[PDB]
Design an enzyme around this catalytic site. Structure first.
Site, short mmCIF file in Angstrom:
data_model
loop_
_atom_site.label_atom_id
_atom_site.label_comp_id
_atom_site.label_asym_id
_atom_site.label_seq_id
_atom_site.Cartn_x
_atom_site.Cartn_y
_atom_site.Cartn_z
CB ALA A 49 -0.86 0.13 1.00
CG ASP A 50 0.29 4.21 -3.17
OD1 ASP A 50 -0.64 4.74 -2.55
OD2 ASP A 50 0.37 4.05 -4.58
CB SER A 51 1.96 7.69 0.52
OG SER A 51 2.38 8.53 -0.67
CG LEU A 52 -4.17 7.64 -3.15
CD1 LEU A 52 -4.80 8.96 -2.71
CD2 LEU A 52 -4.21 7.79 -4.76
#
Ligand code: HEM
Ligand code: ZMQ
Ligand code: HTG
Ligand code: CL
Lengths: 78, 382
Positions: free
Chosen positions: A37-40
């Site tokens: 999971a990325d920062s969005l």
């Protein structure tokens, strides 16, 4: 068959958000490291959980949650 | 809701703790800057870089990401200077001054359509049409296609705001596809037959790709629509809430310059911009570590008492007025002269042609945290 449990509802959301199978989501899986999971993704995950479970999670509490189980525990505790 | 009504007390509480405040709002952790000198210092410092408002490698909204990432606003060295310099030709002091005739013409035409009515909605009847007509004319968008451009701008502005949702971003991706396809086709037309507009200017060229030209047009379209409308409407509400200053300006139209600057300071159309630290940076007795996000609250900096005496007092005679509403440093607003000209002409003409202008009376702000935008502004006159 049965109605959706809390765990199943959490994993459905994670699966849809991160493009993984709802059964590849293990309780011990870390959102960032294991599930990628990325920062969005993580922001959109919290919004989706807040919507699904009709709740408001403070930023300080969301910071604590790193694992699928931690998310399940928070929802159960609240 | 209470924040949107009065964000300035919220800013004040942050400032009293520290002008560079470590915290998290709407799930976004980072440093929240309410201090004037700190804001200015960060904006000047190239080690604080601009960044895409969505994750760099994200393909969840592939078309939105691609459109955003090509814009000069989110580009660093050396791509920024190239992109900015090529677009700057339409916004020189001399070129901006050449827009004055068309602006005056459009303002009078718009005030004509409502003059007999004794009533007006400042945004839909006046502020928006003016801004839309002006920027579409500059870019080279036909009158038939102007309504579609309005829709793209309103949708795409949301995609960068703290208040954005999954729905907003999905809709943003669709509008990104539509806008990019439209401007590519308009660029193909101007390639075969160049016209007297900005699209043609960009095509001449050191040089832009056709996608870079399209994304440039989209950026300017959004800026021309959203923020300029906010300036005009914020200024009108501001003056009507201070009848003594309004009377001063009606009696003395030459005060329009200094009055618009104080409207910029007092109710800034843009409330937030952002930077990322490219390395560890010491400032103001704190350390901002590499990768950490920095959020610059321009409206808050504009109320810093160490710069503006009695900062919460609206005073159109303030001189000079070194507000940060157009930003600061390399990314300082490209169209600031145009925005000021549109506002000055619109407000002065409005006050001249509507001598008994009054508020219709409880104002709603659009749900944007990075911008100060009214939903509507009903007024009565004559
Ligand atoms: C039609 C009028 C306008 C146009 C065409 C326009 C266009 C632009 C463009 C192209 C940029 C990016 C320049 C760069 O990255 O080097 C920019 C930056 C900026 N604009 Fe404007 N703008 C307009 C009006 C306004 C208004 C009314 C405001 C608010 C008072 C505003 C606030 C800003 C700010 C604060 C920045 C810098 C943001 C940052 O540093 O990240 N603009 N503008
Ligand atoms: P990760 O990959 O670690 O996450 C980082 C990231 C992606 C930045 C993340 O979303 C985040 O931390 N925050 C998102 C919130 C954010 O930074 N929003 C942008 C704040 S405002 C901004 O950067 C500058 C814009 C303000 C200038 C306005 C003036 C011009 C008018 C309109 C511009 C229209 C541009 C819209 C293009 C679609
Ligand atoms: C739901 C938890 C997904 S993950 C969670 O996302 C939060 C919000 O972005 C972050 O604050 C936190 O560090 C991260 O572990
Ligand atoms: Cl007053």
């Amino acid at each position: 068959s049965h109605m959706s449990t809390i765990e199943e509802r959490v994993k459905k959301i994670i699966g849809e958000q991160l493009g993984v199978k709802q059964e590849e989501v293990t309780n011990n899986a870390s959102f960032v490291e294991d599930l990628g999971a990325d920062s969005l993704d993580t922001v959109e995950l919290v919004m989706a959980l807040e919507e699904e479970f009709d709740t408001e999670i403070p930023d300080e509490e969301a910071e604590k949650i790193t694992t699928v189980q931690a998310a399940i525990d928070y929802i159960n505790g609240h | 809701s209470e924040f949107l009504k009065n964000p300035y007390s919220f800013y004040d509480t942050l400032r009293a703790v520290h002008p560079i405040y470590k915290g998290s709002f709407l799930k976004y952790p980072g440093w929240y800057v309410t201090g004037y000198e700190e804001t200015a210092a960060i904006l000047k410092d190239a080690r604080f870089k601009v960044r895409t408002p969505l994750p760099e490698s994200s393909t969840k909204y592939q078309d939105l990401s691609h459109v955003q990432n090509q814009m000069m606003l989110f580009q660093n060295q050396p791509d920024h200077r190239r992109l900015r310099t090529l677009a700057s030709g339409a916004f020189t002091p001399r070129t901006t001054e050449s827009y004055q005739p068309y602006i005056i013409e459009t303002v009078h035409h718009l005030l004509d359509q409502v003059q007999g009515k004794k009533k007006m909605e400042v945004i839909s009847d006046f502020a928006f049409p003016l801004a839309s007509f002006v920027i579409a004319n500059i870019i080279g968008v036909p009158e038939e296609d102007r309504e579609q451009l309005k829709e793209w701008a309103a949708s795409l502005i949301q995609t960068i705001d703290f208040t954005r949702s999954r729905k907003a971003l999905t809709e943003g991706n669709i509008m990104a596809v539509q806008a990019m396809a439209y401007f590519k086709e308009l660029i193909q037309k101007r390639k075969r037959h160049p016209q007297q507009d900005m699209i043609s200017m960009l095509l001449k060229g050191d040089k832009l790709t056709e996608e870079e030209a399209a994304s440039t047009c989209i950026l300017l379209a959004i800026a021309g629509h959203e923020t300029t409308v906010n300036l005009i409407s914020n200024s009108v509400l501001c003056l009507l809430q201070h009848p003594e200053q309004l009377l001063k300006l009606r009696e003395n139209p030459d005060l329009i310059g200094t009055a618009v600057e104080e409207c910029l300071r007092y109710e800034s159309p843009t409330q937030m911009t952002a930077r990322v630290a490219s390395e560890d940076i010491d400032i103001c007795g704190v350390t901002i570590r590499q990768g950490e996000q920095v959020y610059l609250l321009l409206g808050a900096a504009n109320r810093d008492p160490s710069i503006f005496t009695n900062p919460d007092v609206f005073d159109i005679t303030r001189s000079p007025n070194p507000h940060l509403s157009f930003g600061h440093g390399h990314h300082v607003c490209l169209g600031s002269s145009l925005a000021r000209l549109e506002a000055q002409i619109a407000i002065n003409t409005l006050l001249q042609r509507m001598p008994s202008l009054n508020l219709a009376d409880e104002w709603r702000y659009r749900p944007l945290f990075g911008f100060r935008a009214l939903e509507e502004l009903p007024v009565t006159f004559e």
